[PDB]
Scaffold this active site. Structure first.
Site: not given
Ligand code: NAD
Ligand code: AMP
Length: 322
Positions: A30-32, A34, A79, A114, A313
């Site tokens: 992450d630091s790179e 950033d 739908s 879903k 569902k």
């Protein structure tokens, strides 16, 4: 030249964004990412005449909208009918078996979670994100382009040198549990309105007029399909279409599976039902689709809904008790 250097930094950022958000397998810390985001921003500030509208630094509109404009989808959406029992699901499979001229053995379904969120449609023109809308009722929605641009896993530019002339990506935007809990905590501290569940947090965030607020909402897209598709020969099965979307930098849920026959599909349903909130976000049910597009087209639709898909569902969260 400066322009080429700028584009090389932006391309590098877009690759890290793909690895981190789409592949879930970042190649750099992450630091790179950033510091490279900072370096790009500094160079754009030094050369503002070279700012591009799809640069990684340009996700957040500077001012709130006065309201949302109505959008009529160019190609309306079907739908989706619901099943609530194994008998309903098996009846839906049997209607397919009774209708297809040549029933393959096995009958493969592409089976998806879903996502409990808000359904949306996002249009890329020659690779660039140009507009996005709520699904709405499948015919008319609202223009939420500025909000959708804030979403970190939504690319502003497709990851390909040969993007379709136009590509409409359809998906669900949701808010994972950890983000949802942080939002509710922040809101109570500030005596601002809280949200009863992550689904409503995602819907309410996407109707936030100020995209500076929306950017602070931890929303995630998972794509489920494609509408408009011009200048592209799409794969001939839904699951390969999804893998293709992933290949060009669009996020898709990693729990989607191909299943052969009714019984394997019920296996999928029961497995995701067991995982309905253990994966860090809410899943409402499953969407079970014939995988082969030619069979989908043969099967067609009735009463606004495809014969080739059903939403099976889960029970509502409030029915889950000791
Ligand atoms: N390893 C990777 O390749 C990778 C890729 C993408 C995101 N991430 C991580 O995901 C987390 C969330 O990322 P996010 O997009 O919410 O950003 P964020 O708000 O968490 O900020 C991440 C970094 O980007 C900088 N930044 C953000 N917007 C900027 C802008 N307009 N101009 C200049 N700098 C800017 C911030 O100052 C910060 O240093 C971060 O921890 C990030 O490091 C990692
Ligand atoms: P939700 O009840 O927010 O969904 C609303 C409508 O969007 C379409 N839809 C959502 N998710 C999917 C997937 N995974 N596949 C196909 N269609 C989806 C349906 O029209 C939902 O009814």
């Amino acid at each position: 030249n400066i322009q080429t250097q700028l584009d090389n930094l932006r391309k590098t950022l877009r690759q890290y964004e793909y690895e981190y958000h789409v592949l879930d397998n970042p190649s750099v810390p992450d630091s790179e990412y950033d510091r490279l985001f900072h370096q790009l921003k500094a160079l754009e500030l030094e050369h503002p005449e070279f700012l591009t509208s799809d640069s990684p630094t340009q996700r957040v509109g500077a001012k709130p909208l006065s309201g949302f404009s109505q959008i009529r989808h160019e190609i309306p959406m079907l739908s989706l009918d619901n099943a609530f029992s194994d008998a309903e699901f098996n009846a839906f499979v049997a209607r397919i078996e009774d209708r297809l001229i040549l029933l393959p053995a096995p009958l493969t379904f592409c089976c998806e979670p879903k996502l409990d969120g808000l359904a949306v449609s996002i249009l890329y023109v020659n690779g660039e994100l140009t507009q996005a809308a709520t699904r709405g009722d499948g015919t008319t929605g609202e223009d939420i382009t500025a909000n959708i641009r804030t979403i970190r896993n939504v690319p502003l530019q497709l990851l390909t040198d040969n993007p379709p002339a136009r590509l409409e990506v359809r998906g669900e935007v949701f808010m994972p549990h950890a983000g949802f809990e942080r939002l509710n905590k922040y809101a109570l501290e500030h005596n601002e309105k809280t949200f009863a569940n992550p689904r409503n947090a995602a819907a309410g965030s996407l109707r936030q007029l100020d995209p500076n607020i929306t950017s602070k909402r931890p929303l995630v897209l998972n794509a489920y399909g494609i509408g408009i598709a011009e200048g592209v020969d799409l794969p001939t099965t839904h699951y390969a279409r999804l893998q293709w979307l992933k290949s060009i930098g669009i996020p898709v849920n990693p729990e989607i599976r191909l299943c052969n026959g009714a019984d394997e599909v019920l296996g999928f349903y029961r497995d995701i039902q067991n995982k309905r909130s253990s994966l860090g976000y809410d899943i409402d049910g499953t969407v079970l689709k014939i995988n082969d597009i030619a069979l989908q087209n043969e099967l067609g639709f009735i009463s606004k809904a495809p014969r080739w898909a059903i939403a099976y569902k889960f029970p509502a969260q409030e029915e889950l008790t000791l």
